[PDB]
Design a protein around this ligand. Structure first.
Ligand SMILES: CCC1=C(C)/C(=C/C2=NC(=C\c3[nH]c(/C=C4\NC(=O)[C@H](C)[C@H]4CC)c(C)c3CCC(=O)O)/C(CCC(=O)O)=C2C)NC1=O
Ligand SMILES: CCC1=C(C)/C(=C/C2=NC(=C\c3[nH]c(/C=C4\NC(=O)[C@H](C)[C@H]4CC)c(C)c3CCC(=O)O)/C(CCC(=O)O)=C2C)NC1=O
Ligand SMILES: CCC1=C(C)/C(=C/C2=NC(=C\c3[nH]c(/C=C4\NC(=O)[C@H](C)[C@H]4CC)c(C)c3CCC(=O)O)/C(CCC(=O)O)=C2C)NC1=O
Ligand SMILES: CCC1=C(C)/C(=C/C2=NC(=C\c3[nH]c(/C=C4\NC(=O)[C@H](C)[C@H]4CC)c(C)c3CCC(=O)O)/C(CCC(=O)O)=C2C)NC1=O
Ligand SMILES: CCC1=C(C)/C(=C/C2=NC(=C\c3[nH]c(/C=C4\NC(=O)[C@H](C)[C@H]4CC)c(C)c3CCC(=O)O)/C(CCC(=O)O)=C2C)NC1=O
Ligand SMILES: CCC1=C(C)/C(=C/C2=NC(=C\c3[nH]c(/C=C4\NC(=O)[C@H](C)[C@H]4CC)c(C)c3CCC(=O)O)/C(CCC(=O)O)=C2C)NC1=O
Ligand SMILES: CCC1=C(C)/C(=C/C2=NC(=C\c3[nH]c(/C=C4\NC(=O)[C@H](C)[C@H]4CC)c(C)c3CCC(=O)O)/C(CCC(=O)O)=C2C)NC1=O
Ligand SMILES: CCC1=C(C)/C(=C/C2=NC(=C\c3[nH]c(/C=C4\NC(=O)[C@H](C)[C@H]4CC)c(C)c3CCC(=O)O)/C(CCC(=O)O)=C2C)NC1=O
Ligand SMILES: CCC1=C(C)/C(=C/C2=NC(=C\c3[nH]c(/C=C4\NC(=O)[C@H](C)[C@H]4CC)c(C)c3CCC(=O)O)/C(CCC(=O)O)=C2C)NC1=O
Lengths: 172, 160, 159, 162, 249, 49, 162, 159, 160
């Protein structure tokens, strides 16, 4: 588990020097943008269950043999299996935006994911068609301004979408 | 070439994709293109007035237009106006491209050869391009006059 | 697109006509959307080459077949490298706004090159069509239209 | 490793639930203090070389026998004094590390983990290092709430020493 | 929530009876039992050998030791099975193993330390890796110690140990607290120069060293693409009957 | 457009005029009598003239 | 039960160590949001009776069959409508409870624990209660940052429903 | 801009480019604002022409001098009619987006014409510059940039 | 030439005495000379560090220092360091003079001829001068870094 605050410590320990002033001016911008980061995080988790089924209205409608007899999302336990861990993508992507660095996500969520997905027999590439459909709905909610003070969180939006692209790359 | 085409070429000869520094360069060009286009429009407005004011500032009532000078014959006066219109027009093209390569490719290629072949005075040409630069920097403003004077001084420095 | 208008008004002895200045101002306005589209196609390159090779080798199996050119791992790696090259030139054409810096590097002599390499050009056109389909799935509607623009130019050029 | 942003994660991960407002609320608190904590980091980094040689000659005052007794552990030899400024200079690094992290994590993982094992084997008495850190917390020249900030982590290393 | 998928168990040593008590060797571990107190040396040995399984000896240290749970064990308020839950669901163990390892390798490392058996196949590691994800790590450690293979073999009041390793390497020794895929992240193979020599001639460096261009860069992409072409048609060319093969209009 | 982008765009104005005389008329220009003649023509209407 | 002050304790208690600055960081952080959270409690307590009957007649709009079908479970006669304002009135209590606690604890322990067990047995569809809570989060009339505050816990009950 | 794009793609053997189709789309999107500018200039025909002509006679009194061309009521009425014609061509160019209506109706052979009429070219150009200044003062600001840049083409092409 | 000498020359070629605009120019130069001298001192402090940081920013770990590149041979690396030290030193002279004429007279005279004769890449030189400009604008401050970047961008624009 690493951070933005702790990773700029950990490489600074490996070189064994004191932290420079332009690294502290970098972290001062991280604190400054912290309030914006928090707001984005709360909107994802409050619409967390609404994203998953709305991704499941297209993850299964686009590749319709998967729930048809024969596919690996066919029976009911099998169907509840790709909702029990469609959300675990959202459970760890929201941990990555909170920490601000994708090192938390890599260790648990994607380290062994591509190995089980050929051991089980599930289509690995049929996951990353719908994790992209999560990202299309996640950045649509995080950007929309409802009852919120006007602000610019564009940088977060692009590197929020970078966490989904890392989440799709190691499965496909 | 462009500034866009120069950025694409510099990214291409390495086999590099478009990294963030190249995107910074292209976004700076896309920021400056507004005043680039407005400056090119108002320079295309009154190019003849700029050339007239420049020869009235620098070349007129000298010995150059007197007999013995290089601008005495009336075909040589017309050739002088043609050369100054060329310098202003190609400086406009280099200002709107944001890259001086078209000056190197189309104007400054074999120009010292020609001007030393014909006996054209080089220092009077440099002072005429300087007067062109002062007149168009007054006419367009300081903020676009800087970029106009950069390419006009490029022509003046390559000529010398 | 600025070099296009500049050599266009440069063949004439006239200046740049202010309608051309209007089109340059409009391209300058749209450059930010162009840069975002190019970065979105930039960071997701290996997905696009993977899905393009997917759809191509599903569509035409003769490159996979040993009589075809892209037989074996080395030849299929060269094939996906060619698709990577064409995606790179498409991003260049997306930034430049007009198809000159992509035709100058990928189109202008491609038929005799692929003829003296043995490869068919129609399979390359189908590969760029697969790249267009994958980028259409990757982007939004107004972004996929503007990407399928230059992808469409490459597909028309290779035929 | 221990960080208030990390402690929100590892609490919510072991429950298997999302980030509630109670984990999210904790993060908000950290920012108010992280603005004053980075004030304390620049105060120690800029005065770093004054503070190390200010400390390693203060410990020689209260313990004059440490420069006199001939031993591998002792700093009486030049080689010990070379390893003097290394060790005390290692402390101000980790104190400045735990300042910008906001937690005691880098202090807990780099410095004090297994410190009772090492000081027993090499016979380095921990009363030496606590005498240097009392010199640092009184002579850093820091003021305001940032003066409180470095004063916790220095004193946290003191209690782990004894 | 969802029940466990059925996984196949491989044949290992401990699925077998191993009859008798007076017959096993010396090398079976000392089966330290809190019911046997008789002294404080047995009390301190029970605490120390319970740290041995959990932290693999080297870590016990001073700081890692939770002094209040050992405070409790002497009193007898909490069983040893409850006491291993205090050591395993402790964040001094979380930073040491749990963050550092993976959900697939954590299943392998906590079965050797809490149940004393290695996982049978990879399918067993695959099976519990889901139970880690939704319930959390302490929810899974709770499910291991509640499990009936634990209570039948160890019981409520016996520290764990490797069951029946007649001819096998010891489990704290064969398995570190982090494996090779994670080794760059917790270890220091990046900064040590001894390993970069090995790395220099490694086949992975030659793929990095090549300039932009060559299809050997796309050779890993070419293996993932698949989609091989069909063979030529079996039917002979001669019959074709080309004169009548053409369709009019 | 190919003739323009091959022999008028990358070269100097007088070099391009002389090379277009090498191609079309098939002989080099004699002196200056032809030279700021065709260059005077180039200054009003362009390459097409 | 889950509270940012409690979550600092149970994290530091399972380690067997004292309260570090990392547990103590959250308390400072919590007060700043707790100042705006108690603003949200008075906004819901004062408008309590308008919000309950505003909600239990909004669910009758989108589900008109619930007042028509004769069932013990349905709200056909007056006894269901008496148990209507009880159940929806129970929700605004626990939402106001989790506001002043700062965490989701009282919401986690009183309301949503075992909610899938009870709604399956009594056949109460959870689509009913989520329709009432969408009416509450849009009609509480709260403004500013306090309007964000009630909006998390309402939406947290929504996700636990589905 | 459609005629120029079509003849430019006609000189080549290929179709219309995606860049050029973006140009046509942006021209359609700005066409309604261009019709608004044409509405204002149509309805301000009188006072714009009179203010520009009187600004010309303030700057250049040589034309209305008795040695000049525009000496007398009829000659000065034809002067104002010439300014009316050029303002009409400017409105055509603002609507079309090309300068080909301005060019092939009033630019292409105007030097030889005004040489044979005895009229100075520079005073025409100064009058169209006065029209540019007047229509710049009437319209909205960057709308006046649009109108004055077509006026700028007419001014630079007359000289 | 100076800014003082340029003002005196511009007043001299007209036969004009020193009018108030020229006195304004000289008094502005006498106001700015303080930070001019301080900037020149701290640039003369650590010129080698600036050149080292600039090649580490722009030119190092590219294909240019790889075999086939123009900086592969060690005499060519030493010539690269020499050229960058020249650009920084003459930009310091032009900053303290307040007039870019010494850049035109001593550096930018026949430099494109030399760099196209030797096959020296021009765009990599422009990016190296850009990295020089960023490093010295960070090192000296923004207020003197503007005037340093003006003459370094003058060298970069004349080179292109
Ligand atoms: C914390 C990170 C983490 C993830 C993501 C994870 C996934 C994971 N998904 C599994 C099964 C499964 N995965 C899926 C999911 C899918 N199959 C489909 O048909 C769909 C295409 C797709 C979802 C979009 C299904 C339906 C099962 C049950 C398959 C079976 O039981 O054979 C299994 C094996 C059995 C299990 O315990 O449930 C694992 C280990 N494990 C992890 O530890
Ligand atoms: C952990 C609990 C918690 C939350 C949720 C929180 C959020 C939060 N977001 C804030 C500001 C803000 N938040 C945003 C966010 C955005 N605006 C947009 O238009 C974008 C689409 C979006 C980012 C993607 C903006 C723009 C501001 C303006 C004020 C600021 O910069 O903080 C502030 C400033 C103080 C206030 O609003 O009273 C708060 C409180 N604070 C807390 O203590
Ligand atoms: C950026 C501009 C650019 C282009 C267009 C380009 C093409 C190009 N394609 C090549 C080979 C190749 N190109 C292909 C092409 C294909 N596989 C198929 O079946 C399809 C027909 C098609 C792609 C899907 C194949 C199979 C080879 C290897 C042929 C051989 O080894 O003879 C080669 C020779 C090997 C090399 O040096 O890479 C070149 C130069 N190079 C360039 O620098
Ligand atoms: C990164 C944090 C960190 C620190 C600070 C650290 C200190 C540390 N200092 C040590 C020895 C030592 N420490 C000292 C320092 C002192 N002895 C004196 O006489 C003086 C009073 C005092 C200095 C002011 C000396 C002289 C030795 C060598 C003693 C020996 O070799 O027996 C040792 C054991 C041997 C070694 O590897 O060198 C450790 C582990 N280790 C760490 O990992
Ligand atoms: C349910 C599936 C399953 C099997 C089969 C199994 C076998 C198994 N056989 C073992 C030993 C052994 N097995 C044999 C067997 C044989 N010697 C012979 O000559 C014969 C050819 C052969 C039997 C027909 C011997 C002699 C040992 C002891 C070897 C030793 O200790 O060195 C052991 C180690 C000690 C123990 O019994 O715990 C295991 C675990 N475990 C399982 O879970
Ligand atoms: C686009 C870049 C470009 C340039 C500049 C160019 C110049 C050029 N200037 C020429 C003559 C001339 N050039 C000048 C110009 C000058 N003499 C002076 O005293 C002044 C200092 C200076 C004017 C500012 C004169 C007076 C002649 C006449 C020589 C003659 O024809 O007898 C000629 C000889 C033939 C001809 O004009 O038609 C060429 C080719 N050609 C080009 O393609
Ligand atoms: C303190 C938090 C808390 C709440 C809110 C709660 C609700 C709750 N409502 C129940 C039944 C009920 N809930 C309702 C309410 C409704 N049905 C309708 O038709 C309407 C749509 C809707 C009201 C708007 C009714 C009518 C019953 C009786 C159903 C039956 O007896 O089968 C039951 C099962 C039986 C019971 O003890 O009365 C529980 C546990 N329990 C709790 O502990
Ligand atoms: C749509 C394009 C178009 C133009 C431009 C145009 C001009 C035009 N100007 C004319 C006369 C004239 N034009 C002027 C013009 C001027 N007085 C000056 O000094 C100024 C420089 C200038 C005012 C701009 C004068 C004074 C006459 C009368 C000359 C005469 O009657 O001989 C005439 C002859 C009489 C007539 O038919 O009106 C034509 C055809 N006709 C056209 O169809
Ligand atoms: C005061 C103004 C001034 C300059 C600049 C100047 C440059 C200059 N650079 C040279 C060579 C060189 N110049 C470079 C420089 C570069 N090549 C690259 O790849 C980089 C882009 C760039 C360095 C930033 C190199 C590599 C050579 C070596 C060519 C050779 O000697 O074989 C030479 C050939 C002889 C020699 O160095 O001793 C000259 C004269 N002379 C001057 O009087």
């Amino acid at each position: 588990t690493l951070d933005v605050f702790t990773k700029v410590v950990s490489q600074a320990d490996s070189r064994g020097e004191f932290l420079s002033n332009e690294q502290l001016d970098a972290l001062a911008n991280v604190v400054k943008e912290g309030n914006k980061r928090l707001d984005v995080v709360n909107r994802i988790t409050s619409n967390a269950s609404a994203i998953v089924t709305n991704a499941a209205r297209a993850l299964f409608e686009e590749q319709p043999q998967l729930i048809a007899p024969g596919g690996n999302a066919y029976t009911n336990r099998r169907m509840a299996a790709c909702l029990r861990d469609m959300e675990i993508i959202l459970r760890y992507v929201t941990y990555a935006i909170l920490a601000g660095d994708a090192s938390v996500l890599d260790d648990r969520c994607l380290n062994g994911l591509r190995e089980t997905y050929q051991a089980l027999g599930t289509p690995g590439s049929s996951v990353a068609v719908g994790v992209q459909k999560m990202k299309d709905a996640a950045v649509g909610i995080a950007n929309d301004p409802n009852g919120i003070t006007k602000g610019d969180c564009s940088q977060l939006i692009s590197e929020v979408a970078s966490y989904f692209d890392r989440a799709a790359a190691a499965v496909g | 070439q462009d500034a866009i085409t120069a950025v694409i070429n510099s990214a291409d000869v390495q086999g590099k994709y478009l990294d963030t520094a190249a995107l910074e360069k292209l976004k700076a060009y896309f920021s400056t293109g507004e005043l680039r286009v407005r400056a090119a429009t108002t320079i295309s407005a009154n190019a003849a007035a700029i050339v007239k004011e420049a020869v009235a500032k620098s070349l007129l009532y000298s010995d150059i237009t007197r007999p013995g000078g290089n601008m005495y014959t009336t075909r040589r006066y017309a050739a002088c106006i043609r050369d100054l219109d060329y310098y202003l027009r190609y400086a406009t093209y280099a200002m709107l491209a944001g890259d001086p390569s078209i000056l190197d490719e189309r104007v400054l290629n074999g120009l010292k050869e020609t001007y030393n072949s014909l006996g054209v005075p080089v220092g009077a040409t440099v002072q005429a391009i300087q007067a062109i630069k002062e007149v168009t920097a007054s006419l367009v403003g300081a903020d676009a006059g800087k970029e106009m004077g950069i390419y006009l001084d490029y022509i003046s420095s390559g000529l010398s | 697109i600025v070099t296009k208008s500049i050599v266009n008004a440069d063949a004439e002895a006239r200046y740049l006509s202010p309608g051309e200045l209007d089109r340059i101002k409009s391209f300058v306005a749209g450059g930010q959307q162009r840069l975002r589209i190019a970065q979105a196609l930039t960071d997701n390159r290996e997905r696009l080459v993977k899905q393009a090779g997917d759809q191509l080798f599903q569509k035409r199996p003769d490159v996979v077949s040993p009589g075809g050119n892209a037989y074996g791992q080395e030849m299929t790696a060269t094939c996906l490298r060619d698709l990577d090259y064409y995606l790179r030139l498409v991003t260049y054409g997306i930034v430049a706004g007009d198809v000159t810096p992509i035709e100058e590097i990928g189109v202008i002599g491609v038929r005799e090159m692929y003829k003296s390499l043995g490869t068919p050009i129609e399979a390359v056109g189908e590969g760029v069509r697969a790249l267009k389909n994958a980028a259409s799935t990757l982007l939004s509607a107004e972004d996929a239209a503007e990407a399928g623009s230059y992808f469409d130019y490459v597909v028309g050029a290779l035929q | 490793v221990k960080t208030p942003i990390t402690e929100a994660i590892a609490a919510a991960d072991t429950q298997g639930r999302f980030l509630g407002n109670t984990e999210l609320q904790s993060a908000r608190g950290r920012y108010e203090r992280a603005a004053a904590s980075l004030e304390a980091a620049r105060g120690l980094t800029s005065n770093a070389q004054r503070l190390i040689d200010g400390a390693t000659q203060a410990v020689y005052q209260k313990f004059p026998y440490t420069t006199q007794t001939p031993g591998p552990q002792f700093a009486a030899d030049s080689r010990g004094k070379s390893k003097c400024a290394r060790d005390v200079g290692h402390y101000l690094r980790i104190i400045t590390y735990s300042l910008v992290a906001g937690g005691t994590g880098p202090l807990d993982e780099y410095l004090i983990a297994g410190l009772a094992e090492i000081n027993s084997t090499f016979d380095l008495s921990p009363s030496w290092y606590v005498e240097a850190l009392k010199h640092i917390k009184a002579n850093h020249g820091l003021s305001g709430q940032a003066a409180n900030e470095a004063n916790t982590y220095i004193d946290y290393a003191i209690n782990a020493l004894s | 929530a969802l029940p466990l998928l059925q996984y196949k168990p491989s044949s290992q040593n401990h699925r077998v009876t191993s009859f008798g008590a007076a017959d096993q060797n010396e090398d079976t571990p000392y089966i330290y039992r809190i019911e046997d107190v008789s002294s404080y040396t047995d009390i301190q040995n029970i605490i120390w050998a319970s740290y041995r399984q959990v932290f693999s000896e080297h870590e016990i240290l001073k700081f890692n030791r939770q002094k209040t749970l050992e405070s409790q064990v002497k009193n007898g308020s909490i069983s040893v099975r409850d006491f291993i839950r205090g050591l395993a669901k402790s964040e001094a163990f979380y930073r040491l193993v749990v963050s550092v390892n993976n959900n697939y390798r954590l299943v392998d490392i906590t079965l050797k330390r809490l149940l004393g058996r290695s996982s049978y196949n990879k399918d067993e590691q695959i099976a519990w890796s889901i139970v880690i994800g939704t319930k959390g790590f302490s929810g899974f450690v709770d499910a291991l110690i509640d499990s009936e293979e634990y209570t039948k073999n160890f019981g409520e009041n016996i520290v764990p140990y490797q069951r029946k390793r007649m001819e096998g390497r010891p489990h704290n020794l064969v398995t570190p607290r982090y494996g090779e895929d994670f080794q760059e992240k917790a270890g220091t193979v990046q900064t040590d120069w001894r390993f970069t020599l090995d790395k220099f001639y490694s086949r992975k460096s030659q793929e990095k060293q090549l300039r932009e261009g060559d299809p050997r860069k796309f050779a890993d992409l070419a293996a993932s693409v698949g989609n091989q072409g069909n063979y030529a048609q079996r039917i002979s060319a001669f019959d074709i009957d080309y004169l009548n093969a053409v369709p009019n209009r | 457009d190919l003739f323009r982008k091959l022999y008028w765009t990358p070269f100097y104005v007088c070099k391009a005029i002389e090379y277009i005389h090498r191609r079309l008329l098939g002989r080099p220009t004699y002196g200056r009598q032809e030279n700021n003649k065709y260059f005077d023509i180039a200054s009003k209407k362009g390459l097409y003239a």
